[PDB]
Design a protein around this ligand. Structure first.
Ligand SMILES: *C/C=C(C)/C=C/C=C(C)/C=C/C1=C(C)CCCC1(C)C
Length: 137
């Protein structure tokens, strides 16, 4: 698996519907969808250790994890969570998340490297799945 790379988004499906579940009001959802157009993911993978940097025009966040060990990050709408990533197959991993404080929809995400050289990210909140497709820069 070579997840490593500089990935740029080419398609984003159901993102607004995802943010709706997460309680984001309509004007901010529209502004967020527009911001997801200028949006890049940088991945460094060594074995089952990952470094992931997610960037938009004005904001950037870094994620560090090892497959199989709990780490802390944030949900899509920004609330801290405990996360755990496992492989589903050679080139797909799934992350389950647990809210640190409080309650909300069940969130998770997946990353997959296709045989065509695309990266596919899915983000889920309850029954809503957002799919985003990236290609290498
Ligand atoms: C493994 C890749 C992951 C976990 C990517 C997560 C991506 C996000 C949490 C993206 C969030 C965004 C917003 C909350 C609004 C602005 C646009 C995005 C897509 C960068």
């Amino acid at each position: 698996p070579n997840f490593s790379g500089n990935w740029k988004i080419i398609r984003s499906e159901n993102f607004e519907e995802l943010l709706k579940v997460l309680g984001v009001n309509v004007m901010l959802r529209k502004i967020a969808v527009a911001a997801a157009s200028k949006y890049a993911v940088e991945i460094k993978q060594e074995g089952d250790t990952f470094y992931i940097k997610v960037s938009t025009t004005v904001y950037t966040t870094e994620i560090n994890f090892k497959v199989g060990e709990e780490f802390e990050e944030q949900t899509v709408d920004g609330r801290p969570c405990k996360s755990l990533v496992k492989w589903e197959s050679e080139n797909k991993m799934v992350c389950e998340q647990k809210l640190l404080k409080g309650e909300g929809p069940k969130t998770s995400w997946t990353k997959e490297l296709t045989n065509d050289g695309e990266l596919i990210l899915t983000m889920t909140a309850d029954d809503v799945v957002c799919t985003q497709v990236f290609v290498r820069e």
